[PDB]
């Protein structure tokens, strides 16, 4: 009755979503075969927001699996939670995108968008009252950025009133693994700007810095990065699923996060996050929870928020806690530190609490921050793109597929306009 | 009183990891991770030995 249709495209999108459904199935108590086998009624009361119902007491997720290469399709179901998804929802192409935004948007994604949308209309129109959509992908690959932006356009023209979310892994600043990811990132901002209500920018080296400095892993892999991303997705929609003292659902935080309909790029963050050697030295309380919550080390976006000003901040809490101390010290972080908050909004920070913590913690919270300093994430891709367009570096892989130089010129112009958006609202 | 459990020195409680291999942290909790190789040494000395007769 407040359900959301999950969308996921690309190898990064499928692997992040696969780990996301593992976290959700643990917290709701859903075994890999898909039967509720938990310990409380308050895990099944709102099971319909993510899981459907199948005969025999079986709970099928509402996610639809999208890729252009069928190699990741076998990897998703062969994972430890891969039998949970419906085989009809596994919709996919036969030829890979090859890190090309043109193939994902024009050539290969055109025949596949009509097939996935039928599965999307399948799982969205069986809802009595749909709350919105949630798509996770990456902005470095071909089907993650190409078809991940085409799917955004088709849903918004079909469901304009419903909210749309995007968990986009925007490409890493210093370390890289694709030579054309500046091309794919530049062409995928303009579609994100005009047709998305929440966009959470996630960086790989920001996750790596978290895995190194905070967690002290010996050898982090992609499973650990999807583990940390899945903390946000479960943490953001905690009020849709579990009761709270003062709850705030998916759309209500959106209202007091974006002052204007284009500045919708946030930095995620998970507060209660501790290395093995420092577990016994740390006491799980709220004042230490909110001090790691606002730390730049804990941020899952590799842009320092002290370089800009926080336009709007929010942090939804989970666990049995007292409202007074949450309210007074989230005031304090505005008061002891008033330089990185915008002066033209008096209270920049939204609070919300859920009674039920994640399974595995006494108490938890996550972070959503709309800061100005995410413009330094974008204009550095711009200088990394304007080094390639002037010499036409890898342009023939794109113009030979049904594009032109005008689309790159405009996509640079809308991206430079958004970097101009945050700079004026910082200076104001 | 009704709520309690915030005041009067109830901070003396569980560190959320008493030790390794506990059955309570699971995967929804963000304390256990796949990337930490507790057998990183034991896998290494297996591989140090494995390259020798190779």
């Amino acid at each position: 009755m407040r359900e959301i249709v999950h969308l996921q495209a690309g190898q990064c999108g499928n692997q992040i979503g696969a780990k996301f459904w593992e976290v959700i199935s643990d917290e709701h108590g859903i075994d890999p075969t898909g039967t509720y086998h938990g310990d409380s009624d308050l895990q099944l009361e709102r099971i319909n927001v993510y899981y459907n119902e199948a005969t025999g007491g079986k709970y099928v997720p509402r996610a639809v699996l999208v890729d252009l290469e069928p190699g990741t399709m076998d990897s998703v179901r062969s994972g430890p939670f891969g039998q949970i998804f419906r085989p009809d929802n596994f919709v996919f192409g036969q030829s890979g995108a090859g890190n090309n935004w043109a193939k994902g948007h024009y050539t290969e994604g055109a025949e596949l968008v009509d097939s996935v949308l039928d599965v999307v209309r399948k799982e969205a129109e069986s809802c009595d009252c749909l709350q919105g959509f949630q798509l996770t992908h990456s902005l470095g690959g071909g089907t993650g950025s190409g078809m991940g932006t085409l799917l955004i356009s088709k849903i918004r023209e079909e469901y304009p009133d419903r909210i749309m979310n995007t968990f986009s892994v925007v490409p890493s600043p210093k370390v890289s693994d694709t030579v054309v990811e500046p091309y794919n990132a530049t062409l995928s901002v303009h579609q994100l700007v005009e047709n998305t209500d929440e966009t959470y920018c996630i960086d790989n080296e920001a996750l790596y810095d978290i895995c190194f400095r905070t967690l002290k892993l010996t050898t982090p892999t992609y499973g650990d990065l999807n583990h940390l991303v899945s903390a946000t997705m479960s943490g953001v929609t905690t009020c849709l699923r579990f009761p709270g003292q003062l709850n705030a659902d998916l759309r209500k935080l959106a209202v007091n996060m974006v002052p204007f309909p284009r500045l919708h790029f946030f930095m995620p963050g998970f507060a209660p996050l501790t290395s093995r050697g420092s577990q016994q030295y740390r006491a799980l309380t709220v004042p230490e929870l909110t001090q790691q919550m606002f730390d730049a080390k804990n941020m899952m976006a590799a842009c320092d928020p002290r370089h800009g000003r926080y336009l709007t901040v929010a942090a939804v809490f989970r666990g049995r806690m007292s409202m007074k101390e949450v309210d007074e010290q989230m005031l304090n972080v505005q008061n002891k530190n008033s330089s990185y908050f915008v002066e033209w909004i008096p209270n920049n920070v939204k609070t919300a609490v859920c009674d039920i913590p994640p399974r595995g913690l006494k108490m938890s919270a996550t972070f959503i921050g709309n800061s100005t300093a995410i413009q330094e994430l974008f204009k550095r891709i711009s200088e990394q793109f304007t080094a390639m367009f002037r010499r036409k570096a890898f342009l023939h892989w794109y113009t030979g597929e049904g594009m032109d130089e005008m689309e790159f010129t405009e996509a640079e112009s809308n991206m430079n306009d958004l970097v101009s958006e945050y700079q004026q609202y910082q200076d104001a | 009183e009704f709520d309690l459990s915030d005041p009067l020195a109830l901070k003396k409680d569980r560190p959320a990891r008493q030790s390794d291999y506990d059955a309570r942290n699971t995967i929804s909790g963000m304390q256990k991770f796949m990337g930490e190789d507790l057998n990183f040494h034991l896998r290494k000395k297996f591989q140090e030995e494995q390259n020798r007769e190779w």
């Binding site: 399709m73 076998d74 | 796949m34």
Partner: peptide, 27 residues
């Protein structure tokens, strides 16, 4: 060591072989 947790594990000697039992459309 973390191979079960990659495609479907049937090849015993090398568990990092491809297994398109899926894809491969029914036509």
């Amino acid at each position: 060591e973390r191979a079960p947790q990659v495609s479907n594990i049937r090849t015993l000697d090398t568990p990092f072989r491809k297994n398109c039992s899926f894809s491969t459309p029914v036509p």
